[PDB]
């Protein structure tokens, strides 16, 4: 029972929406990040069991990953772009909180975050 359940990718009680900004986040931002050579460790939830990180979910209480973000986008889980941007930010910050500066995973995260920030800089106007 070591890993927690993953973050939800759908919810019957959460209102759903498609916006051009959310479309951009899936088509341009996530797509660009997903194919980056350092993306793979972020493409699914951290498996603290398999990775032998027994304290991971003791430290990180709001886990997030690009696999979850991808599904949320594909499922129209979000109401707005801010919610999705928040998930990306949580993913990166979690990584910086858990690992030490100069760990390879942190360098990988930093590469992805730089690219993330460049793509969301050109987030289009709503509608
Ligand atoms: C993401 C993330 N956030 O915190 C941690 C911790 C991770 C993380 C780190 C490594 C992962 C990983 N491979 C791995 C395992 C041990 C040492 C070094 C690495 C790499 C530098 C190659 C990433 C894998 C994997 O090998 O499948 C998956 N998720 C990981 N998450």
For domain 19-123, which architecture applies?
Up-down Bundle (1.20)
In the chain, where the domains are located: 19-123
DSSP 68-123: HHHHHHHTT--SSHHHHHHHHHHHHHHHHHHSPTT-HHHHHHHHHHHHHHHHHTTP
Any idea how long the chain is? Answer: 127
Residue 102 CA to its chain's centroid (Å)? 21
Q: Which experimental technique did the depositors report for determining this structure?
A: X-ray
Ligand 1 centroid–CA 41 distance in Å is 5
- Rounded CA separation 80/83 (Å): 6
Asked whether 116 and 95 are in contact (CB, 8 A), the reply is no
The angle subtended at Cα 25 by Cα 33 and Cα 73, nearest 5°, is 100
Residue to mutate, 66, 91, 105, ligand 1, most ligand atoms under 8 Å from C-beta = 105
Resolution for the entry shown, Å: 1.9
CA 117 to chain CA centroid, Å, is 13
Q: Counting atoms of ligand 1 from 1, which one is nearest the CA of 51?
A: 15
Is residue 61 within 8 A of residue 4, CB to CB? The reply is no
Q: Is the dihedral of CA 58, 61, 66, 72 positive or negative?
A: positive
Taking CA atoms, 105 is separated from 3, 41, 47, in Å, by: 20, 8, 14
Residue 65 DSSP label:
-
Q: Rounded to an integer, what distance in angstroms lies between the CA atom of residue 122 and that of residue 104?
A: 28
Whether the CB-CB separation of 123 and 21 falls below 8 Å is answered with yes
Q: Is 126 in the pocket of ligand 1 (CB under 6 A)?
A: no
CA of 104 to the centre of ligand 1 (A): 9
What is the rounded (10 degree) CA torsion for 99, 60, 7, 126? -70
Distance 90 CA to ligand 1 centre (A): 17
Q: Does 104 sit in the ligand 1 pocket, CB within 6 Å? A: yes
């Amino acid at each position: 029972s070591m890993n927690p359940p993953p973050p939800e990718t759908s919810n019957p009680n959460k209102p759903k929406r498609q916006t051009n900004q959310l479309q951009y986040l899936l088509r341009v931002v996530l797509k660009t990040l997903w194919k980056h050579q350092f993306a793979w460790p972020f493409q699914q939830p951290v498996d603290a069991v398999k990775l032998n990180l027994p304290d991971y979910y003791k430290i990180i209480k709001t886990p997030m990953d690009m696999g979850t973000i991808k599904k949320r986008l594909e499922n129209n889980y979000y109401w707005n772009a801010q919610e999705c941007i928040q998930d990306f930010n949580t993913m990166f910050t979690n990584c910086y909180i858990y690992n030490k500066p100069g760990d390879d995973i942190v360098l990988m995260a930093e590469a992805l975050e730089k690219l993330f920030l460049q793509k969301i800089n050109e987030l289009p106007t709503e509608e």
